[PDB]
Amino acid sequence: KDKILGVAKELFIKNGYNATTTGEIVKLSESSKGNLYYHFKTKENLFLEILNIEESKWQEQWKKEQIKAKTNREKFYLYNELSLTTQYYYPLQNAIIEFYTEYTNINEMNKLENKYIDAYHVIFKEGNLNGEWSINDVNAVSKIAANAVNGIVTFTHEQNINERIKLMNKFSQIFLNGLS
Amino acid sequence: NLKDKILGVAKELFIKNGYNATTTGEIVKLSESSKGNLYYHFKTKENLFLEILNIEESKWQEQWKKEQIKAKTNREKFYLYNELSLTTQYYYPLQNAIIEFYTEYYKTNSINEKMNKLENKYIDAYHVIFKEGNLNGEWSINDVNAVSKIAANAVNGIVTFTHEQNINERIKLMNKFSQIFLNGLS
Numbered sequence: 001k002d003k004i005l006g007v008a009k010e011l012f013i014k015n016g017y018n019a020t021t022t023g024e025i026v027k028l029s030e031s032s033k034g035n036l037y038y039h040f041k042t043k044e045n046l047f048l049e050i051l052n053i054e055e056s057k058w059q060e061q062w063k064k065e066q067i068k069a070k071t072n073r074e075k076f077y078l079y080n081e082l083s084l085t086t087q088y089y090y091p092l093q094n095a096i097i098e099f100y101t102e103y104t105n106i107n108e109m110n111k112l113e114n115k116y117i118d119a120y121h122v123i124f125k126e127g128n129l130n131g132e133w134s135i136n137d138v139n140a141v142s143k144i145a146a147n148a149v150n151g152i153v154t155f156t157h158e159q160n161i162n163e164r165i166k167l168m169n170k171f172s173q174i175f176l177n178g179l180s
Numbered sequence: 181n182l183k184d185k186i187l188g189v190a191k192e193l194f195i196k197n198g199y200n201a202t203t204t205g206e207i208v209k210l211s212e213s214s215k216g217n218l219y220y221h222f223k224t225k226e227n228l229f230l231e232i233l234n235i236e237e238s239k240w241q242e243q244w245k246k247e248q249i250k251a252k253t254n255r256e257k258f259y260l261y262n263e264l265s266l267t268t269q270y271y272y273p274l275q276n277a278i279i280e281f282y283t284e285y286y287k288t289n290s291i292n293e294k295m296n297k298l299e300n301k302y303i304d305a306y307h308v309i310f311k312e313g314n315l316n317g318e319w320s321i322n323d324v325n326a327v328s329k330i331a332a333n334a335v336n337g338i339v340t341f342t343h344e345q346n347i348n349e350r351i352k353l354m355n356k357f358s359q360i361f362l363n364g365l366s
């Protein structure tokens with residue numbers, strides 16, 4: 001089970017959903033095509049299970065890291081820097097978008113997105129309560145921030161990590177200064 | 181037209197079935213050609229696709245050339261460029277092929293280098309906006325290169341990762357973004 005999950009995740013990250021075949025998982029995970037079945041049934045269910053684990057791991061990791069930022073302003077900076085460095089969830093976004101632009105309401109996938117946006121919602125709601133900013137539509141600002149940061153993460157993979165952190169911090173500064 | 185008919189047919193098939201499901205045997209049979217000849221003009225399925233994107237990219241640039249004339253200030257041009265990126269990607273028939281292609285070859289240094297040259301033309305559009313804006317006194321931005329990359333990546337994140345099917349709400353979110361972003365530059 002655990003060899004199929006690890007190799008699957010890696011191939012999905014490296015090649016996306018379509019280019020990863022159950023045969024290719026079978027060959028590199030030392031297990032039968034019927035071994036993948038029963039444990040996972042289908043390629044889709046294996047991927048969705050990988051996403052469940054990834055988003056739980058990401059959410060665990062953020063629970064621990066957010067104590068390090070005292071203000072919600074600092075938490076926005078921190079969360080966005082961590083999205084670039086984390087091994088969890090963010091590395092799969094290209095596989096996730098592809099899977100999303102193919103699959104049949106499994107879409108009920110939207111509770112995976114709402115979780116990923118909810119970190120910003122807490123940040124922005126709590127910042128509202130602690131007088132750090134005034135935001136009337138937190139739901140909208142949360143979605144905008146999350147998807148914007150996701151674009152900065154996902155579309156700058158080619159680059160040096162220090163420069164990516166520098167671009168991201170400038171984004172965070174512009175964005176927060178724009179809530180003024 | 182060996183090369184041009186393969187381009188047209190490949191485009192149709194990429195629209196119809198996406199990048200991954202479309203094979204070179206299909207492209208060549210419907211073009212009345214051969215895989216040896218496809219290999220000759222484009223070497224790979226990957227490079228054939230990249231050539232289509234370059235022709236399409238050129239069409240997008242000429243559209244923006246004539247559409248930006250209706251936005252008086254560079255501030256208005258920023259809002260418009262972002263809304264156009266969104267609405268165009270929403271109906272664009274090659275969009276799914278582009279996503280499939282990108283999500284497969286984004287970590288391949290060979291292809292991913294050529295993807296960057298395409299992407300940089302988008303960032304250049306933003307650079308012109310922000311530079312012209314500096315000159316016109318609409319804002320004062322020190323690193324126009326950084327800000328242009330940030331805008332381009334941020335706008336396309338909003339377009340790609342947003343799941344709201346309602347195009348009205350998507351447009352509203354993008355215009356809010358443009359407002360926040362520009363307000364942050366002051």
Ligand SMILES: CN(C)c1ccc(C(=C2C=CC(=[N+](C)C)C=C2)c2ccccc2)cc1
Pocket residue numbers: 155240265268269272278279282299300302303332333336340
């Ligand atoms: C048809 N059409 C107008 C467009 C089509 C595609 C793009 C994209 C993109 C993403 C990031 C970019 N950056 C960071 C410069 C540039 C382009 C893009 C979206 C999803 C997957 C790959 C690329 C934009 C416009």
